[PDB]
Amino acid sequence: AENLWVTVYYGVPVWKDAETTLFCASDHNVWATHACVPTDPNPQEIHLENVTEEFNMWKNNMVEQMHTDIISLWDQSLKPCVKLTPLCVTLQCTNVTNNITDDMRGELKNCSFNMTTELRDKKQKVYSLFYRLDVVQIKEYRLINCNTSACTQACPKVSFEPIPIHYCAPAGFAILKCKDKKFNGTGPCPSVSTVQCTHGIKPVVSTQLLLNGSLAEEEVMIRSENITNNAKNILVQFNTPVQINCTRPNNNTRKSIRIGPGQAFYATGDIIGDIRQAHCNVSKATWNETLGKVVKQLRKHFGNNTIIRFANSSGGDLEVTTHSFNCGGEFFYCNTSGLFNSTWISNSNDSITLPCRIKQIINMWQRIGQCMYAPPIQGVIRCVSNITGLILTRDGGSTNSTTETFRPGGGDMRDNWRSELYKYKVVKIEPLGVAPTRCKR
Amino acid sequence: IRSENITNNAKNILVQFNTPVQINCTRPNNNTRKSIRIGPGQAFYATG
Amino acid sequence: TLQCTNVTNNITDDMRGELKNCSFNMTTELRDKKQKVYSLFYRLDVVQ
Numbered sequence: 001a002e003n004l005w006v007t008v009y010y011g012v013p014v015w016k017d018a019e020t021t022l023f024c025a026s027d028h029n030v031w032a033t034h035a036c037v038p039t040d041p042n043p044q045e046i047h048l049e050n051v052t053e054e055f056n057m058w059k060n061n062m063v064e065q066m067h068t069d070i071i072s073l074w075d076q077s078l079k080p081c082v083k084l085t086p087l088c089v090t091l092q093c094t095n096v097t098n099n100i101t102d103d104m105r106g107e108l109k110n111c112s113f114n115m116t117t118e119l120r121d122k123k124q125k126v127y128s129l130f131y132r133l134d135v136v137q138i139k140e141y142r143l144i145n146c147n148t149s150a151c152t153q154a155c156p157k158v159s160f161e162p163i164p165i166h167y168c169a170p171a172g173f174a175i176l177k178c179k180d181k182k183f184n185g186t187g188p189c190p191s192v193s194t195v196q197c198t199h200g201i202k203p204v205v206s207t208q209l210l211l212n213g214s215l216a217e218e219e220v221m222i223r224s225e226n227i228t229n230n231a232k233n234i235l236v237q238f239n240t241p242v243q244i245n246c247t248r249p250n251n252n253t254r255k256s257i258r259i260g261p262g263q264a265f266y267a268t269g270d271i272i273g274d275i276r277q278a279h280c281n282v283s284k285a286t287w288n289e290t291l292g293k294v295v296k297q298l299r300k301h302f303g304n305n306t307i308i309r310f311a312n313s314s315g316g317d318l319e320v321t322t323h324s325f326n327c328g329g330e331f332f333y334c335n336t337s338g339l340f341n342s343t344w345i346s347n348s349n350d351s352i353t354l355p356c357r358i359k360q361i362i363n364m365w366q367r368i369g370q371c372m373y374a375p376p377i378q379g380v381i382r383c384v385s386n387i388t389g390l391i392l393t394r395d396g397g398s399t400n401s402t403t404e405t406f407r408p409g410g411g412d413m414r415d416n417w418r419s420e421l422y423k424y425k426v427v428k429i430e431p432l433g434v435a436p437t438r439c440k441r
Numbered sequence: 442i443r444s445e446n447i448t449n450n451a452k453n454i455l456v457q458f459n460t461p462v463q464i465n466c467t468r469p470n471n472n473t474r475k476s477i478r479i480g481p482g483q484a485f486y487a488t489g
Numbered sequence: 490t491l492q493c494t495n496v497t498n499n500i501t502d503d504m505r506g507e508l509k510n511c512s513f514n515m516t517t518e519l520r521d522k523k524q525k526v527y528s529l530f531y532r533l534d535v536v537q
């Protein structure tokens with residue numbers, strides 16, 4: 001005695017987890033914003049009441065899409081640049097000993113070599129100042145990348161500065177944002193909203209320290225796909241940024257050598273004045289209190305009476321064993337030994353100085369056979385950044401001892417994107433629905 | 442037997458079998474491949 | 490330019506001059522260096 005019939009409803013607010021291709025939006029640069037949709041002056045956020053959604057930062061396809069887009073943009077920006085195939089020549093290198101400190105012992109090589117000119121039948125004897133990490137002995141030396149692939153000198157006019165990027169979904173798709181503070185990136189989120197696209201995310205390439213990122217608005221956040229598994233990288237998000245001041249104080253000189261028709265190689269001529277190591281400075285008290293916050297947050301996961309130890313990176317490439325980043329076109333690799341060096345037991349104005357080594361030959365992503373040569377930057381360089389998080393790895397894990405050791409980690413830039421896209425997911429709207437109603441056609 | 446125009450000798454005749462004929466093709470030389478670095482990240486594979 | 494000789498070691502009567510042992514100069518990873526190498530080419534692949 002029901003006499004119910006099918007009734008079709010179009011425009012129903014129902015969605016399903018889906019993977020699609022988000023497009024860029026933003027307000028010469030490597031991150032090509034000239035192909036991005038203009039961002040709306042007043043973006044609209046729809047706050048969904050009574051909606052609880054399942055989120056998982058460690059299986060988000062947005063991270064993979066961002067990784068692919070960033071790699072593609074990096075490749076695109078380098079295509080219309082000079083290829084330094086002639087640079088693979090025998091180098092007559094001597095030690096740069098004019099006005100050097102004891103920490104720059106043999107770190108710079110004054111290398112003279114023959115080079116091609118615009119005329120095919122003429123050669124020019126030139127010289128350049130290379131870094132010890134960029135050359136390898138065969139007094140005779142050759143560039144490190146010569147036995148793997150030819151390097152592409154980045155065009156100098158293109159800037160490496162991160163620019164915020166918004167990832168907006170196509171029609172029929174929505175971006176659900178988890179507004180729940182204290183959210184650890186996985187599980188039900190009861191405070192949900194719909195956004196045309198996220199906040200402006202800057203693609204900051206850094207290892208062992210998340211830089212110029214977002215800050216937790218409540219407290220330090222510890223996130224891990226499986227915290228009990230030591231193989232999983234722990235993402236730490238700060239609530240108070242730690243100011244870091246990184247400088248190369250050498251007054252570098254950039255000379256230009258015509259290596260062919262319309263092709264210029266930018267060499268380091270001579271350093272004006274004293275030569276001393278590039279470095280970074282981090283406030284000691286701020287770092288200590290941030291580490292205390294991280295320790296008391298980790299105690300929730302690893303017990304209240306455990307010993308929390310911070311030590312050096314285990315080993316590997318220079319990219320991962322050191323805080324690797326870019327500061328105004330020059331690629332720094334900083335020995336973060338004064339930061340993660342302490343033990344914590346449950347119970348003024350100086351700063352930690354991290355020495356840094358500069359590199360010109362760069363393999364940014366974990367790829368072999370695709371290298372980039374950074375042209376030298378004219379003059380001293382200084383840059384100030386916010387440390388907003390960490391990429392830690394837990395050492396050991398056996399139950400014999402009651403101490404937990406965390407070491408800096410990185411290498412894979414997907415984690416860097418994951419720390420910004422943790423509170424976002426993509427869904428596809430299913431407007432069609434069928435329901436029972438007493439109405440009959 | 443198939444042909445666009447069988448009477449025209451210029452047209453190729455396509456013959457399709459019903460019983461395949463097994464053919465065994467071999468190069469019995471124990472060739473040695475060596476690699477010569479001809480440039481940065483470029484290898485030429487020669488017969489040693 | 491290839492300096493080619495006849496491959497005559499342990500060859501049959503049906504392989505008379507079918508393989509050429511050719512030595513030549515070649516580029517290396519370093520632009521200012523050359524390497525003397527050799528390879529076994531086929532008679533159909535080289536011309537005097």
Ligand SMILES: *[C@@H]1O[C@H](CO)[C@@H](O[C@@H]2O[C@H](CO)[C@@H](O[C@@H]3O[C@H](CO)[C@@H](O)[C@H](O[C@H]4O[C@H](CO)[C@@H](O)[C@H](O)[C@@H]4O[C@H]4O[C@H](CO)[C@@H](O)[C@H](O)[C@@H]4O)[C@@H]3O)[C@H](O)[C@H]2NC(C)=O)[C@H](O)[C@H]1NC(C)=O
Nearest residue numbers: 159161162211212325326327328377378379382383384385
């Ligand atoms: C985190 O964010 C902070 C703040 O945004 C970042 O710190 C800023 O970093 C930028 C870039 O390093 C820096 O801007 C530079 O300031 C210099 C001093 O004023 C300028 O000289 C420099 O301009 C040159 O470079 C630009 C490209 O980078 C060119 O567009 C410009 O024309 C200049 O280029 C000329 O001069 C150079 C040098 O002589 C020469 O080689 C060229 O051929 C050309 O002749 C930049 O504008 C900010 O000053 C920094 N701000 C602060 C507060 O520190 C920090 O880097 C971010 N962290 C990370 C990891 O990204």
Ligand SMILES: *[C@@H]1O[C@H](CO)[C@@H](O[C@@H]2O[C@H](CO)[C@@H](O)[C@H](O)[C@H]2NC(C)=O)[C@H](O)[C@H]1NC(C)=O
Nearest residue numbers: 095096097098110111112127128129269270271
């Ligand atoms: C690197 O080497 C070059 C050449 O070996 C040096 O250039 C010479 O500088 C002196 C001055 O001290 C001049 O008298 C010479 O004529 C220069 N030679 C050439 C070919 O330019 C250069 O000074 C060295 N730089 C460093 C930092 O050691």
Ligand SMILES: *[C@@H]1O[C@H](CO)[C@@H](O[C@@H]2O[C@H](CO)[C@@H](O)[C@H](O)[C@H]2NC(C)=O)[C@H](O)[C@H]1NC(C)=O
Nearest residue numbers: 089090091092111112113114115123125126521
């Ligand atoms: C640039 O090329 C010249 C010429 O090839 C080099 O000078 C030669 O050096 C070799 C030793 O390696 C000598 O046997 C030759 O007699 C030299 N010839 C001349 C004309 O000088 C020179 O050494 C090269 N420079 C660099 C930096 O590699």
Ligand SMILES: *[C@@H]1O[C@H](CO)[C@@H](O[C@@H]2O[C@H](CO)[C@@H](O)[C@H](O)[C@H]2NC(C)=O)[C@H](O)[C@H]1NC(C)=O
Nearest residue numbers: 211212213215239240241242243384385386387
């Ligand atoms: C480093 O962190 C400080 C503090 O979080 C940032 O200063 C804030 O900048 C925003 C601009 O978007 C302002 O709205 C806030 O009022 C500022 N707060 C304070 C306390 O100054 C600073 O911009 C950050 N710098 C970088 C490079 O990320």
Ligand SMILES: *[C@@H]1O[C@H](CO)[C@@H](O[C@@H]2O[C@H](CO)[C@@H](O)[C@H](O)[C@H]2NC(C)=O)[C@H](O)[C@H]1NC(C)=O
Nearest residue numbers: 245246247248279280281350351352353382383
């Ligand atoms: C990092 O800190 C060091 C000190 O630990 C700074 O070195 C001082 O720099 C000032 C320049 O303003 C000089 O006047 C002092 O003589 C230096 N002292 C020492 C002991 O080196 C360094 O300048 C700081 N660098 C940055 C980028 O902040």
Ligand SMILES: *[C@@H]1O[C@H](CO)[C@@H](O[C@@H]2O[C@H](CO)[C@@H](O)[C@H](O)[C@H]2NC(C)=O)[C@H](O)[C@H]1NC(C)=O
Nearest residue numbers: 311312313314315316320321322335336337341
């Ligand atoms: C972390 O600290 C340890 C020691 O405190 C460093 O080990 C040193 O490594 C250098 C280079 O291999 C050696 O010359 C020293 O003798 C080592 N010291 C000791 C006490 O063994 C380790 O290199 C540091 N980690 C990083 C990434 O720099």
Ligand SMILES: *[C@@H]1O[C@H](CO)[C@@H](O[C@@H]2O[C@H](CO)[C@@H](O)[C@H](O)[C@H]2NC(C)=O)[C@H](O)[C@H]1NC(C)=O
Nearest residue numbers: 312318321322334335336337338341353354355
């Ligand atoms: C990072 O810094 C630490 C601290 O200076 C380095 O460890 C030092 O290594 C030297 C070897 O040149 C030893 O003489 C010191 O005794 C070590 N000090 C300590 C406290 O262990 C470490 O080698 C640096 N990392 C790299 C890769 O050089």
Ligand SMILES: *[C@@H]1O[C@H](CO)[C@@H](O[C@@H]2O[C@H](CO)[C@@H](O)[C@H](O)[C@H]2NC(C)=O)[C@H](O)[C@H]1NC(C)=O
Nearest residue numbers: 462463464465466467468469470471501502503
């Ligand atoms: C093709 O046929 C010839 C003979 O018709 C084969 O030559 C024989 O190969 C076997 C190897 O199993 C030897 O034991 C004989 O001594 C060979 N006899 C002669 C006269 O050559 C040849 O192996 C066959 N090849 C293939 C690929 O089937």
Ligand SMILES: *[C@@H]1O[C@H](CO)[C@@H](O[C@@H]2O[C@H](CO)[C@@H](O)[C@H](O)[C@H]2NC(C)=O)[C@H](O)[C@H]1NC(C)=O
Nearest residue numbers: 489495496497498510511512525526527528529
């Ligand atoms: C092709 O020619 C090369 C060189 O002309 C031969 O290599 C030589 O082999 C002999 C052994 O019989 C060695 O003593 C020489 O030192 C080798 N020379 C070089 C430059 O490698 C090679 O054996 C020849 N191969 C054939 C099939 O004829």
Ligand SMILES: *[C@@H]1O[C@H](CO)[C@@H](O[C@@H]2O[C@H](CO)[C@@H](O)[C@H](O)[C@H]2NC(C)=O)[C@H](O)[C@H]1NC(C)=O
Nearest residue numbers: 490491492493511512513514515523524525526
């Ligand atoms: C590789 O190059 C060298 C040098 O160009 C060649 O040796 C020369 O051969 C010519 C004859 O063609 C002589 O006139 C020269 O005197 C030789 N010079 C030297 C330094 O040996 C050699 O023949 C080349 N090899 C091949 C296989 O072509």
Ligand SMILES: *[C@@H]1O[C@H](CO)[C@@H](O)[C@H](O)[C@H]1NC(C)=O
Nearest residue numbers: 093094095096105106107139
């Ligand atoms: C250059 O200096 C380094 C370290 O001081 C030393 O190992 C090397 O032998 C020196 N090379 C010279 C003097 O050619």
Ligand SMILES: *[C@@H]1O[C@H](CO)[C@@H](O)[C@H](O)[C@H]1NC(C)=O
Nearest residue numbers: 136137144145146147148149
């Ligand atoms: C290039 O040379 C370095 C040191 O000379 C070596 O470690 C590396 O394995 C070499 N790479 C290749 C592809 O030969």
Ligand SMILES: *[C@@H]1O[C@H](CO)[C@@H](O)[C@H](O)[C@H]1NC(C)=O
Nearest residue numbers: 182183184185186187188225
């Ligand atoms: C923190 O992550 C764990 C991982 O399983 C999850 O069970 C828990 O619900 C998360 N925290 C909150 C407050 O949801």
Ligand SMILES: *[C@@H]1O[C@H](CO)[C@@H](O)[C@H](O)[C@H]1NC(C)=O
Nearest residue numbers: 225226227228229230231397
């Ligand atoms: C986490 O990793 C441990 C091994 O270290 C494993 O026993 C456990 O089942 C994992 N947990 C999940 C939820 O996968």
Ligand SMILES: *[C@@H]1O[C@H](CO)[C@@H](O)[C@H](O)[C@H]1NC(C)=O
Nearest residue numbers: 249250251252272273379380
């Ligand atoms: C670097 O050297 C140039 C040329 O002598 C000079 O004009 C400039 O002021 C110097 N800069 C610094 C920071 O010493």
Ligand SMILES: *[C@@H]1O[C@H](CO)[C@@H](O)[C@H](O)[C@H]1NC(C)=O
Nearest residue numbers: 243244245281282283351384
């Ligand atoms: C970094 O530089 C700023 C000035 O730009 C200064 O106020 C701050 O104290 C410095 N911090 C450190 C740790 O050197």
